[PDB]
Design a protein around this ligand. Structure first.
Ligand SMILES: [Fe+3]
Ligand SMILES: [Fe+3]
Ligand SMILES: [Mn+2]
Ligand SMILES: [Mn+2]
Lengths: 333, 329
């Protein structure tokens, strides 16, 4: 390289602020400069970021003409409409709950620039997901306030989001810190609540309901949007699992039998709430969909989430939706 | 526009829940605790939603832009020491500036912008800052620069540090866990943060840099870097427009905060930013390069400062001409 290809320092004291890769930590890292991306330590976080960036899509790119025609017709049963409406109601605000939590709760305490890069991509993706639900409401001529207010008006939805508020913990409190054992444990419970429970269990169950319509060639515009959402959420979940496991590895003292058991109990509570939600969606069942299938499915996926964070499966049920894993394989990171 | 079909309404089983549906006229940009901030609808601030849609339409990645010709030129003796200095100082400053801006959106601004459509835009903007950060890593890796030397520039170069230190100062107490915007004093402090990041950092401190880098691009030098900066400029144009709309919106809804005292303080902050940016330009350009001299930046930085002032309802103060009119093409 030619002469003059280096920045010359005129503050010699400042070279000390260059970041030692091995000093970097996922949480509680105040000893190095968090504003400098380099050198990247958590290559897994950066890879998630690059993968997410390659997945750009917008709901407005997906035509809704056939969906509008079907929705406005008399072809759908009231029970079919009920599944769609309840799913829209729950997702319309749940995306914002997730996005707001990334920004208002998680970001401050993930003291690492490459992980934060991913968080910014994820949060933007949640904004895209929120746009999706606005777009669907406007396209089909739904009462947008009725749909977006569903979590205040439908008990089985409220129950899930009230639980979400509970497991959010005090992470939003101005006094909240992660530099105690109890504090970092509370933080990890928040991560489990959002990545494992909301994104990894509540959302996957909604995906089955909606994609079951897509597979029947009903509401294929909504279906396609949900396929893109599933592709994003696959990465959200993978990142969250990696982050939880990373925090555990770097802070083994938090991973007590007590914390482990509580995480199991939260997942159990999520499973029960999602089953009750599925029953509210499907009081009689529709073509290809019964509540009993969600009992097995929700238990199955909960076992898969438990395994990924080093906990034993507890339900041992089989997956009644083998095709979900087919589209999951196609939408794999 | 077809008829609403029978059975197409979601039935409530919590009868009083309907009261939490959001009244459009109750929404506000700050201090809005009377309605549910989680529900996007109904959208009140159309300008915020439009910025969001515009940003989303602007997707790009630095890895899409070929660096072959740039690598070839960087290896050659066809780029002078002085030209290299301009490039490296700009890479040094921008490499961390993007993170400063992005971190401030998330850690300072988002909590206090109590409006979902504006928050939708903020998430787009913060992601764009991540793309800009990626851009500087990609440039470093492409040209084989010492990445730690580049990203640490704001700790190693006085003229860069001076800008970023001033930035830390105008960030104010907004990061204080117990900072609140629900007083005149609190909201004025918040507005100073918005001026500091949108107007000063994004609207002024990026501009000598844009001119310098795009000057190379216009001479067919480092066109890979140039193209990346063109995409950054496109994004930053929206960032600035959103910030101006946000500042003006907060003023309109809370006119009592916009005192002669605050107005004077903002002008003085902008004057100081101008001085610091002129000094930075001087550091970049101890000697002239083609179509670029440090003295030109006196006129330019003052000219853009006047333009920013006008946009937030303040009188221009410098009255200088723009030596780089091609920046508006
Ligand atoms: Fe998600
Ligand atoms: Fe910006
Ligand atoms: Mn989502
Ligand atoms: Mn930027």
């Amino acid at each position: 390289v030619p002469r003059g290809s280096h920045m010359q320092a005129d503050i010699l004291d400042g070279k000390q602020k260059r970041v030692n890769l091995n000093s970097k930590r996922l949480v509680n890292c105040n000893q190095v400069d968090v504003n400098q991306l380099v050198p990247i330590k958590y290559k897994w976080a950066w890879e998630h970021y690059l993968n997410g960036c390659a997945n750009n899509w917008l709901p407005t790119e997906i035509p809704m003409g056939k969906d509008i025609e079907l929705w406005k017709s008399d072809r759908l049963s009231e029970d079919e409409r009920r599944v769609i409406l309840l799913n829209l109601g729950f997702f319309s605000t749940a995306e914002s709950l997730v996005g707001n939590n990334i920004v208002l709760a998680i970001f401050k305490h993930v003291t690492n620039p490459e992980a934060r890069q991913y968080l910014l991509r994820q949060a933007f993706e949640e904004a895209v997901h929120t746009h999706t639900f606005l777009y669907i409401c406007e396209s089909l001529g739904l009462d947008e306030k009725e749909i977006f207010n569903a979590y205040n008006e439908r008990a089985a939805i409220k129950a899930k989001d009230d639980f979400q508020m509970e497991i959010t913990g005090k992470v939003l409190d101005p006094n909240f810190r992660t530099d105690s054992v109890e504090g970092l444990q509370e933080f990890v419970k928040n991560l489990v609540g959002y990545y494992i429970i909301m994104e990894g269990i509540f959302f996957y169950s909604g995906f089955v309901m909606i994609l079951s319509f897509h597979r029947q060639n009903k509401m294929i515009g909504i279906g396609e949007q949900y396929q893109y959402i599933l592709r994003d959420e696959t990465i959200h979940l993978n990142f969250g699992i990696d982050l939880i496991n990373g925090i555990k590895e770097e802070n083994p003292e938090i991973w007590t039998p007590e914390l482990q058991q509580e995480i199991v109990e939260l997942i159990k509570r999520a499973v029960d709430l999602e089953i009750e939600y599925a029953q509210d969606c499907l009081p009689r069942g529709i073509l290809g969909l019964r509540a009993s299938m969600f009992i097995d499915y929700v238990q199955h996926i909960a076992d898969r989430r438990l395994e990924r964070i080093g906990l034993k499966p507890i339900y041992h049920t089989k997956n009644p939706f083998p095709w979900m894993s087919e589209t999951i394989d196609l939408n794999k990171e």
